[PDB]
């Protein structure tokens, strides 16, 4: 998609983005991105040869801040986008009615079929 | 854990479970079907299982 | 028992035997001791077992069904209506299935009822089996293993198409 | 363990193809293969113009 | 009546307990020679009674339980049967192999290995008696290579002695080329009469039976030792004394003819079939005949004795003769 | 199935944070309440499958394959120990870790909905067996086997992603569901024959169809014994699964280019049954036993039969439980000789005087004794091929010969009748290694008792 | 530990040191050892052996390995699989080759050629056809109970 | 005994967990409730379900 909000060319999230629901607390992908921040530290305390899941406590703290923090700004982003998708979807159904014709549905008392019996 | 609690217990489990793939449904279900045609005296199982009036062949 | 409409018999009959001999007939005693060495204590123990279930009781309940109404006046696409009518033909296939064992339940009856007196009182069961799977071979036969319904449609516009094609042309 | 590798594993070297490798290794692959699939060429055409016309012990055939 | 019924299932189900028995024991059994023979004997006893009742009356009946895969048009229980056949051959079968229980006993009083022996042996009589009484045709085929494997198991009882295991070999070889004839006619079976059951198959009589006969044929001269797949049967001798005598006496190889003996409303047509029959035989019964000289092998002998024998049961085929075949087996 | 997924995913790290000289009793006993837990799924009734929101559902025809890959973990995990029990604690964790990420990404694709989700739990279950088979394979070519195992599988399986892409593209969502009622036949022209020679050429890779069939022996031969049953087992009889999810669509056209593949693969298992006759190297017989296995299911798939859909599940189920048995009996018999090779370790009547009832009962299995599944499967196969062609029925007997013949030459050869009397070393049969003979053979027996469970959606 | 040179590849050109090489490798006679020769088919430079080896070397020797009929070095011929007792047992027949085969498929044709001889001359005591009641015994062949009989009575004689 | 070794409960309470989330996504597709033809009754008698 090209813009379509070629206006404002970095505004990362709009007054349009105020109008759908943010990211919810307990959603599986932030859930996940806080275990990836998990095993971020894990494997930092693995490369500096200090003991793993000990003495960088401070460390994991951190990791799964940021985190959770920049996987909550990216699904708020990723929610609006696709939103905008669907409307802009929406709104060319709505605009143009005869390129998009509603296909007369024949039910299976009418509509042949070509069998080719398999034995 | 292997022979005592999931060995005899499967088997047992196995030995009964409930009618899977509807089998004992099915029995009771064509005894009642096949007393019913024969209480009406129409063929047991008449062919054209879909209605041979509720059709539209492709005419030449 | 069942009921005897659907699982019918001949008339039971038995003739009666007469020595001629005096030995006399060890196989009558050696029945009469198996009866009361068995058929007693076997009697007991059912009755026994009678009065224990006879206490307090279960039921269940034999499954029916409503009817929708069929794969035709579902459209083009109808995701959620030839699901429908798909189930309910699949269950009319397996309660068919069963109605073929049952008949074939009842030929080999009659084969084993009549011994070498065949071809007397057997060819109505071989009569009416062949009409039956007459009706299964026109019908369920060949659709493959991926049948859903819609096989089974396109084979039943297929035969009477051309029966009627036939019947026209010949006519 | 000497004949052992010398016949799992140090036969693909050594190799070269000759006249006797290629004809022996094209008549002993792929000869068998067209033979039998001719003769079922054979057999699914009679099976098909044999059902197709209708003079077969199908008044019951029932086990698909 | 149910007591006739019940009678032939405690002769069937006799031959369980001392297999079971030994496999839960934990406390060393010696006497097992002596379990064997008391529960046999009281098998033979038990199914001399059946016998005594079919005589007296006729009263044919099969008896069938615990379906399993009905799964399309067809099913399958345990099912067997009891006719003239399954009436008057068991306790000729049970009283042969209690007698060579007595023999073994003696015979093999040396080898402290004997609860082995025995477990085979018994095993071995189940399963033939499983092939002598069944109707559902995937039992038959059960005892067909349930008894092949017994057979390969009790002529290579002893271990070492190459040839024998080769023997042993040989016999499970010629017992698949049994078994691809035998699956040949339960497919004719299958695809043109709806299933293999023995009811349904003599309630018709598809008449055009030239594929399923010539597949029972081979069947029947692969299990029976005759001609072009006889070979197996001195090899076969080179086993123990015993395991000779159940094995190729009044088991093992009377069931090649047995199972023709048992289609004989199958074979009251098709001449071609009888012809079939009695020209193998014959060819089989010369070749033992000729063979037969020079011989210093006394087993070898009574091999190619017996060979003969079934030469004559297979001409005895070739008339439309089944119950006379039958007796030929008894004796 | 959530139920079953993220009890795995609780497991993984216990065996990471467990203490020395107690990985092992908690992996075996968290594996077997497992057991019990796949043990209650089984519950299929009737007209539809059971799903469960959108990813998840069950059929029979995944039903016990899902059973046999959480019944095959214990087993597969006790079958690995003393061949690595010398190695590191940090190794032996990260090993058994490994195994089970690996049959965690098994049911993932055991109990998947879109064939998509289908193709990327397939390589996921190709990556972690490379890793195990050429770090642990134990001899001087795991290194050319696990190359061989990961380039066949990729290069074939790729272009049934684009073919997948474009059945996204040209018919909606693909939940198998849809895909059954949204299907429309696709005539003989050109493109749908690629499309098709695409999807089943991959599968046929992953069989293995008997033109590409060098893939799995130096696999086989050349793995430690935990890869080496799930390499066999789970990954040919998944192979097997994806090819009867996706012959769904596209029927009308397999009557026209099955008739190679059908050629090929009967061919090719009268080759394979001869060739595994007289090899060296008594761990490869069963290798390309298993070939001729997978070849007879593929006939059996690609002839389009309910009878020939029931006896492939069957004989899948049966031949993953014995190939897998037979292989740990080899594993066995290896610890003992330090050989591999068939005609140095003789003898094992005199001694080992059980252990030869369990090679004795393996065999017979494999051999098609009549109460195994193995003879319930072959007997459908061929019912439903001489209902196909009428003549093919010789190449079927003439295969059941031939198996016969070499599975009880394998018996008798290293086991029938003289010790070399130089060996010198067996010990008596350890407990384990019976113990995993009772939990292969116990619930063959005890599936053949009741055996209408097995048997395919086409019940 | 074992030498990767131990192993066998490429065949006996150049002739001194190949032989020298394989007569020292193999354990054998020097100028006896003889390669295959060098025919594409895989098979190294493995010797060439007298293809029975195991129904001869009667048992009496008393050499190591009591039923594979090896003692331990040897160049173990490239048939070990197959030459074995228990599989292919290739003892010095008491006769001949030809005549043995010549004989045997001579006995055969002759029963078949007597078979043909036998079907085409058939052979029958004097009796006539059997004289079934109902018309040839309708009512207990293929069926139609009451509706196309063939009348033939029988006539005495 | 419970804080002495946890080793052995971690997975019981993972499947628990899992046959929670089962039940959550029950009521979260929890539509169609009455509205099938095939399994269509009244509402009756207990309180306002006929699924959980
Ligand atoms: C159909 C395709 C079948 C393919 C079969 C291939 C068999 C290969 C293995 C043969 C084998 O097991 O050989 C062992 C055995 C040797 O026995 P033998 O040499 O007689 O030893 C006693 C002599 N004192 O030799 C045998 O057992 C020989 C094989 C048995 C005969 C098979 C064919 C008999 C029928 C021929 C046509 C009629």
């Not at chain 1, 000990?54 to 982003?77: E, P």
């Not at chain 8, 539509?31 to 699924?51: C, D, G």
Request: glycine fraction near 4%.
């Amino acid at each position: 998609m090209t813009g379509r909000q070629a206006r404002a060319p970095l505004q990362f999230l709009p007054d349009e983005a105020r109008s759908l629901p943010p990211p919810k607390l307990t959603d599986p992908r932030l859930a996940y991105i806080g275990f990836l921040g998990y095993c971020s530290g894990l494997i930092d305390n693995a490369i500096r040869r200090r003991p793993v899941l000990s003495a960088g406590l401070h460390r994991q703290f951190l990791y799964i801040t940021s985190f959770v923090f920049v996987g909550y700004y990216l699904l708020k982003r990723q929610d609006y986008m696709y939103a905008v998708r669907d409307h802009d979807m929406f709104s060319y159904i709505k605009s143009h009615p005869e390129d998009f014709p509603e296909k007369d549905k024949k039910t299976y008392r009418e509509v042949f079929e070509e069998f080719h019996p398999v034995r | 854990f292997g022979f005592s609690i999931v060995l005899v217990l499967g088997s047992t489990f196995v030995a009964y479970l409930p009618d899977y793939r509807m089998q004992e449904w099915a029995r009771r279900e064509a005894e009642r079907l096949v007393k019913y045609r024969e209480a009406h005296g129409l063929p047991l199982m008449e062919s054209n299982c879909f209605d041979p009036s509720k059709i539209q062949l492709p005419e030449d | 028992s069942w009921d005897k409409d659907v699982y019918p018999e001949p008339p039971r009959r038995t003739p009666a035997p007469s020595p001629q001999t005096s030995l006399p007939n060890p196989i009558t005693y050696l029945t009469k001791a198996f009866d009361l060495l068995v058929d007693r204590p076997v009697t007991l123990v059912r009755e026994f077992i009678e009065r224990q279930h006879a206490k307090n009781k279960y039921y269940y309940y034999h499954r029916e069904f409503r009817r929708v109404p069929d794969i035709t006046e579902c459209h083009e696409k109808d995701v959620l209506c030839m699901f429908e009518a798909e189930m309910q033909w699949k269950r009319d296939y397996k309660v068919d299935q069963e109605i073929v064992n049952i008949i074939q339940e009842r030929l080999k009856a009659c084969q084993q009822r009549e011994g070498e007196s065949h071809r007397q009182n057997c060819a109505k069961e071989l009569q009416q089996f062949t009409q039956v799977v007459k009706a299964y071979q026109d019908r369920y036969h060949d659709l493959g293993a991926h049948y859903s319904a819609r096989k089974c449609l396109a084979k039943q516009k297929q035969r009477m198409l051309a029966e009627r094609k036939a019947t026209k042309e010949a006519a | 363990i000497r004949w052992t590798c010398a016949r799992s594993a140090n036969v693909y070297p050594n190799f070269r193809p000759n006249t006797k490798t290629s004809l022996l290794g094209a008549l002993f692959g792929i000869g068998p293969l067209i033979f039998w699939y001719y003769v079922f060429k054979t057999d699914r055409d009679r099976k098909e113009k044999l059902i197709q016309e209708g003079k077969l012990d199908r008044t019951f055939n029932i086990s698909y | 009546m149910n007591l006739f019924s019940s009678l032939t299932l405690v002769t069937l189900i006799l031959l369980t307990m001392p297999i079971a028995a030994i496999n839960f024991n934990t406390h060393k059994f010696t006497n097992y020679p002596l379990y064997v023979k008391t529960t046999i004997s009281c098998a033979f006893i038990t199914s001399m009674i059946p016998t005594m009742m079919f005589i007296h009356t006729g009263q044919e009946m099969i008896i069938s339980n615990w379906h399993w895969l009905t799964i399309q048009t067809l099913k399958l229980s345990l099912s067997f049967k009891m006719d003239f056949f399954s009436m008057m051959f068991v306790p000729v079968a049970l009283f042969v192999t209690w007698s060579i229980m007595e023999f073994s006993m003696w015979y093999m009083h040396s080898d402290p290995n004997i609860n082995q022996f025995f477990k085979y042996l018994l095993l071995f009589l189940i399963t033939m008696l499983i092939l002598v009484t069944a109707n559902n045709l995937f039992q038959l085929f059960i005892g067909w290579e349930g008894v092949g494997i017994m057979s390969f198991l009790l002529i290579g009882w002893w271990y070492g002695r190459t040839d024998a295991n080769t023997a042993a070999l040989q016999a499970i070889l010629y017992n698949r080329i049994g078994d691809i004839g035998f699956i040949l006619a339960m497919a004719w079976f299958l695809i043109n009469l709806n299933t293999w059951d023995l009811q349904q198959i003599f309630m018709l009589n598809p008449n055009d039976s030239n594929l399923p006969l010539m597949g029972l044929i081979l069947a029947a001269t692969g299990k029976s030792a005759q001609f072009g797949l006889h070979p197996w049967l001195p090899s076969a001798m080179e086993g123990p004394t015993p395991v000779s005598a159940l094995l190729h006496s009044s088991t093992m190889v009377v069931a090649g003819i047995f199972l023709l003996i048992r289609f004989y409303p199958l074979t009251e047509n098709n001449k071609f079939g009888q012809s079939i029959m009695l020209c193998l035989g014959a060819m089989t019964t010369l070749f033992t005949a000729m063979c037969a000289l020079t011989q210093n092998d006394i087993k070898k002998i009574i091999a190619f004795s017996t060979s003969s024998q079934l030469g004559l049961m297979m001409v005895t085929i070739g008339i439309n003769q089944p119950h006379l075949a039958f007796l030929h087996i008894c004796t | 199935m959530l139920k079953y997924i993220i009890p795995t995913m609780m497991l993984m790290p216990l065996t990471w944070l467990s203490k020395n000289s107690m990985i092992w009793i908690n992996t075996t006993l968290h594996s077997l309440l497992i057991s019990l837990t796949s043990l209650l799924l089984l519950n299929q009734f009737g007209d539809n499958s059971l799903n469960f929101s959108l990813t998840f559902f069950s059929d029979s025809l995944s039903t016990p394959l899902l059973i046999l890959t959480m019944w095959l973990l214990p087993l597969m995990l006790m079958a690995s120990q003393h061949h690595l029990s010398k190695e590191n604690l940090a190794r032996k964790k990260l090993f058994i870790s490994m195994l089970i990420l690996l049959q965690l990404f098994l049911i993932m694709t055991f109990t998947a909905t879109e064939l998509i989700f289908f193709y990327i739990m397939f390589e996921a279950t190709l990556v972690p067996t490379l890793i195990i088979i050429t770090r642990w394979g134990n001899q001087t070519e795991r290194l050319n086997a696990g190359l061989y195992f990961l380039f066949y599988t990729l290069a074939g399986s790729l272009p049934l992603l684009v073919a997948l892409i474009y059945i996204q593209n040209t018919m909606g969502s693909l939940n198998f569901l849809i895909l059954q009622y949204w299907v429309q036949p696709m005539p003989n022209s050109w493109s749908n024959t690629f499309m098709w020679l695409a999807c089943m050429m991959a599968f046929m890779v992953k069989m293995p169809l008997y033109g590409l069939h060098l893939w799995l022996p130096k696999a086989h031969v050349e793995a430690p014994i935990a890869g080496s049953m799930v390499l066999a087992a789970i990954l040919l009889k998944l192979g097997g699964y994806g090819m009867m999810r996706i012959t769904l669509l596209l029927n009308p056209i397999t009557d026209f280019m099955a008739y190679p593949f059908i050629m090929l693969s009967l061919w090719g298992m009268i080759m394979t049954s001869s060739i595994c006759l007289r090899q060296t190297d008594l761990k490869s017989l069963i290798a390309y036993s298993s070939v001729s296995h997978m070849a007879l299911v593929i006939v059996a798939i690609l002839i389009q039969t309910p009878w020939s859909y029931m006896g492939a599940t069957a004989l899948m189920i049966a031949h993953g439980l014995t190939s897998s048995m037979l292989f740990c009996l080899a594993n066995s018999n290896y610890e003992r000789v330090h050989s591999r090779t068939m005609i140095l370790a003789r003898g094992l009547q005199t001694l080992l005087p059980l252990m030869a009832a369990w090679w004795l009962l393996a065999s017979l299995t494999n051999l098609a004794l009549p109460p195994s599944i193995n003879l319930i499967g072959e007997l459908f196969v061929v019912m439903s091929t001489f209902s196909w062609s009428n003549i093919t029925i010789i190449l079927m007997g003439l295969n059941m010969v031939i198996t016969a013949l070499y599975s009880l030459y394998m018996l008798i050869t290293t086991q029938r009748g003289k010790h070399t009397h130089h060996i010198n070393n067996i010990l008596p049969s350890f407990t384990r290694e019976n113990a995993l003979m009772s939990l292969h053979m116990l619930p063959l027996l005890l599936l053949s008792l009741n055996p209408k469970i097995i048997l395919g959606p086409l019940y | 530990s074992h030498i990767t040179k131990d192993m066998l590849p490429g065949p006996y050109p150049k002739t001194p040191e190949e032989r020298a090489a394989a007569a020292k490798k193999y354990n054998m006679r020097v100028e006896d050892y003889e390669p295959y020769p060098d025919d594409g088919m895989g098979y190294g430079d493995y010797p060439k052996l007298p293809d029975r080896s195991q129904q001869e070397r009667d048992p009496w020797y008393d050499w190591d390995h009591p039923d594979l009929r090896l003692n331990w070095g040897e160049p173990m011929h490239w048939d070990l699989d197959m030459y074995i007792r228990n599989r292919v047992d290739t003892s010095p027949t008491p006769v001949n080759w030809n005549l043995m085969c010549k004989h045997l498929f001579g006995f055969v044709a002759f029963m078949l050629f007597m078979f043909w001889v036998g079907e085409t001359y058939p052979t029958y005591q004097p009796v006539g056809p059997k004289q079934y009641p109902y018309n040839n015994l309708y009512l207990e062949r293929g069926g139609d109970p009451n509706k196309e009989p063939e009348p033939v009575v029988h006539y005495e004689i | 005994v419970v804080r002495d070794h946890w080793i052995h409960v971690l997975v019981p309470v993972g499947f628990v967990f899992g046959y929670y989330l089962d039940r959550k996504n029950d009521e979260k597709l929890a539509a169609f409730r009455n509205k099938s033809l095939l399994y269509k009754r009244e509402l009756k008698p207990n309180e306002e379900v006929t699924w959980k």
